[PDB]
Amino acid sequence: GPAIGIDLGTTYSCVGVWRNDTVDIVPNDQGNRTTPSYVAFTETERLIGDAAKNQVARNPENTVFDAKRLIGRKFDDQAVQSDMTHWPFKVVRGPKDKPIISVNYLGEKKEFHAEEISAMVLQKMKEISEAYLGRQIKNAVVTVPAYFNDSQRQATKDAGAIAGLNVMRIINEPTAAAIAYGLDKKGTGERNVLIFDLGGGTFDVSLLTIEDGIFEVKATAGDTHLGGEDFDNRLVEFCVQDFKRKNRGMDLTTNARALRRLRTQCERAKRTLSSSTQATIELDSLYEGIDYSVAISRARFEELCADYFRATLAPVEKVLKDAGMDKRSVHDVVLVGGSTRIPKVQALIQEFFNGKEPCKAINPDEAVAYGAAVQAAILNG
Numbered sequence: 001g002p003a004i005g006i007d008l009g010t011t012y013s014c015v016g017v018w019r020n021d022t023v024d025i026v027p028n029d030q031g032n033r034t035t036p037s038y039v040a041f042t043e044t045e046r047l048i049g050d051a052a053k054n055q056v057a058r059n060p061e062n063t064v065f066d067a068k069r070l071i072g073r074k075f076d077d078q079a080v081q082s083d084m085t086h087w088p089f090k091v092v093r094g095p096k097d098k099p100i101i102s103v104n105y106l107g108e109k110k111e112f113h114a115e116e117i118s119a120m121v122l123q124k125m126k127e128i129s130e131a132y133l134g135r136q137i138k139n140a141v142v143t144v145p146a147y148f149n150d151s152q153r154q155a156t157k158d159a160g161a162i163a164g165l166n167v168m169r170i171i172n173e174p175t176a177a178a179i180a181y182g183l184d185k186k187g188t189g190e191r192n193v194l195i196f197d198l199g200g201g202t203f204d205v206s207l208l209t210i211e212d213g214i215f216e217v218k219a220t221a222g223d224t225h226l227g228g229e230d231f232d233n234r235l236v237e238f239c240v241q242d243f244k245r246k247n248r249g250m251d252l253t254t255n256a257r258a259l260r261r262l263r264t265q266c267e268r269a270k271r272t273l274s275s276s277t278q279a280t281i282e283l284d285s286l287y288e289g290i291d292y293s294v295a296i297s298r299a300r301f302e303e304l305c306a307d308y309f310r311a312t313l314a315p316v317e318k319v320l321k322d323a324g325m326d327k328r329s330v331h332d333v334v335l336v337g338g339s340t341r342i343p344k345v346q347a348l349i350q351e352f353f354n355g356k357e358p359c360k361a362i363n364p365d366e367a368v369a370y371g372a373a374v375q376a377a378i379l380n381g
Ligand SMILES: Nc1ncnc2c1ncn2[C@@H]1O[C@H](COP(=O)(O)OP(=O)(O)NP(=O)(O)O)[C@@H](O)[C@H]1O
Pocket: 007, 008, 009, 010, 011, 012, 013, 034, 198, 199, 200, 201, 202, 203, 227, 228, 229, 267, 270, 271, 272, 274, 336, 337, 338, 339, 340, 341, 342, 364, 365
């Protein structure tokens, strides 16, 4: 049958298919090409994606996200123990030091491995692809960060198997982006490719070398706690303080629904600021019947995340140093991840590369899935 390519992201997942000998990115039920990597359990149903993410404030203990931060890892890992302190869902020690997510589902305590949560997200990707292609799908290529170990790779493959997918190969995310642009066919000799990947929760910089279609990850650097979510946090913080001074120090964070309405609008304001210089937040009866509105400029947003945007350049320096390579030696600079849509992030990378135009023709949050779909087709014959 036909083969698909899946980008199983920390915050958003994306699937690419083949129609008429080309790659199509599968739109979900909301017309979006990316789906939140969220699952939720209630007394009557399980919710996936947007439906799960939108009810997070109403059901925090049973809304699971960030399964990618847990997949193939051990319960006692310092990274796992640190992440657990910011999660409202319960994580316990299972046998063989395996993390167990503990929720309530259909009126009973239910346990899940991180790969069972990721399997739900992968099953949703299989469903939308089947609806889109009008046929059964099993063959897939699933991507992972280049730094993932054998345990994390195997657990991602297991998530695929639990979802009913035949995982033909687990490939690296930066390699998938390079494949998406046909960088393994661009010129003669050796090709140096830098993948600049800024998504919802993570920042990954990878330096690859290509020679005669063979890819080699030379160096990787980044921050697993730097993404679009942190930029929203800065906008949310600004609006929370602005409501305090407008309303005698009143704190809207005490009301989960009010904070969620604000956060939802900060996310949309941020997205508007990638195409417009002005964004408007206007929320009637936000907190204690008090109306809230604010005009947020692109300059203000850039000023609020000034430190974050600057900190993206250090891992670019780290990959070039680690490989003993100069920035002028890079033949292709590839923009990957939804947060690379931010004009200031684009301007900073281009300035660093002395005006060099990046590879950005493919939607940055779709490139990994696009590349995974190309690889899937090759492997499927
Ligand atoms: N037009 C836009 N302007 C600014 N940010 C955007 C825009 N569109 C999407 N984003 C951000 O893109 C992020 C999701 O990036 P995406 O690359 O889809 O996540 P991912 O694949 O799960 N990677 P990650 O979270 O790092 O592991 C969210 O924080 C969005 O707010």
